[PDB]
Design a protein around this ligand. Sequence first.
Ligand SMILES: O=c1ccn([C@@H]2O[C@H](COP(=O)(O)NP(=O)(O)OP(=O)(O)O)[C@@H](O)[C@H]2O)c(=O)[nH]1
Ligand SMILES: [Cl-]
Ligand SMILES: [Mg+2]
Ligand SMILES: [Mg+2]
Ligand code: NA
Length: 327
Amino acid sequence: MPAYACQRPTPLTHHNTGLSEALEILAEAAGFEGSEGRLLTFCRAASVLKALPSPVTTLSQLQGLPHFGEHSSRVVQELLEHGVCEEVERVRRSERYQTMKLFTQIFGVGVKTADRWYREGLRTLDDLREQPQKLTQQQKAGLQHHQDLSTPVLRSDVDALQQVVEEAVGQALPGATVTLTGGFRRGKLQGHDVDFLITHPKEGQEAGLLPRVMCRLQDQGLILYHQHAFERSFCIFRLPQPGSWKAVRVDLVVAPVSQFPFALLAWTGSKLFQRELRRFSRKEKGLWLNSHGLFDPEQKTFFQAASEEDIFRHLGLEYLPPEQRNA
DNA sequence: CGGCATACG
DNA sequence: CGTA
DNA sequence: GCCG
Ligand SMILES: O=c1ccn([C@@H]2O[C@H](COP(=O)(O)NP(=O)(O)OP(=O)(O)O)[C@@H](O)[C@H]2O)c(=O)[nH]1
Ligand SMILES: [Cl-]
Ligand SMILES: [Mg+2]
Ligand SMILES: [Mg+2]
Ligand code: NA
C-alpha cells in the first residue's frame, strides 16, 4: 500500500465503509478545532481503507498500512470489537460538533465564522436569522436557500442543467464547450452541487467569457444568487421540478484550452486526491502542480500537457480514471 | 523535528 | 474572510 | 496524527 492516495486506485464504493466513516468524523472534528494536520492524517487513514480489496476483520490487518498509528488503530480496534468507538460517539453527540457542522454547511460560512458564532452563543439557524445584520449577502443567500441546498442533487438532475448552461455558453461564445467535472465525473450518483468546466478550442477566445455566460443565465431567470472580470463562479440556480423548482448549487470555471487538462484534473477531484497529488508532485518530483499547469522551478519551464494521461505520465504515476480518484 | 495543496472571488 |  |  503506497503512502500517497494518488498512487493507488480508490473506487467510489468499497469494503470498509463503516470504518472509513468513523475516521472521517474525527477528521471533520479536527478541522472544526483548527487542526489541519490531524484532519489530514484521519482523512488519509480513511482513504487507505477505501483502497483495500476486502474488509478489515482483525487488527493485525492494519500492520504496515500507512497512516495507521496508535490513535487510528485504536479507533478501528474498538469498532471491530464493540461495533462502536466511544471517542467517535462522543464527538457525534457533542454540541460543538453538531453546531459547527450545521453552521459550516451554510454557503458563505466557513470554520472561522462558525467558531466565532459558536463562541458568541449562537446554536441554530433561527438564531442566525434573528440577527440578519451580521450576515453577508452571500450568507443571507445560503441561509435562505439552506433547505433546498441540503437535499442531494441527483445525477438525473445534471443533464437538464448541463443543457441550459450549454445554451447560454453557445450564445456567449459559439464553439465553447461545457464539461461535467467534480464528483459526478467520478461516478457519484448524488452531489452537493454540479461542477462544470468551460473552454474553447482556439486559445485566447475564452478570455472574458464567464461574465457573458452569467449575464445570459441571469436574463433567462435561472440565477437565484451569484457574486455579480472573473473565471470562477459559485452560483445558486433555479432547477425545474414537477409543478415547481428547487435551488441547486452550480460551479462554473473557465480555462484556456492550453490549461484544460490541468483544470480538468484539478476540478475532478476528489479534494483529498488533489491535495495528495500536489503534495506528491512537490515533495517527490520537485514539480509544482496547480489547476493551471505543472512547473519545474529549476528549469523555470511549464509542462505542456494535452491530456490528463500526459500529466500522470510526467509525474511518473500510473493513470487513474476519474472513477478511481475517490480518495 | 518540519510539513501538511493551491488559487480565485 | 469566503469558495472550488 | 502520522511520515520521513
Ligand atoms: O478545497 C477544495 C474543494 C474542492 N476542490 C476541487 O474541486 C472539486 C469540486 O469541489 P466540490 O466541493 O464540488 N466537491 P465534489 O467532489 O464535487 O463532491 P460534492 O460534495 O458532491 O460536490 C473537488 O472534487 C476538487 O477537485 C479542491 O481542489 N479543493
Ligand atoms: Cl483546485
Ligand atoms: Mg461538486
Ligand atoms: Mg463545487
Ligand atoms: Na460553508
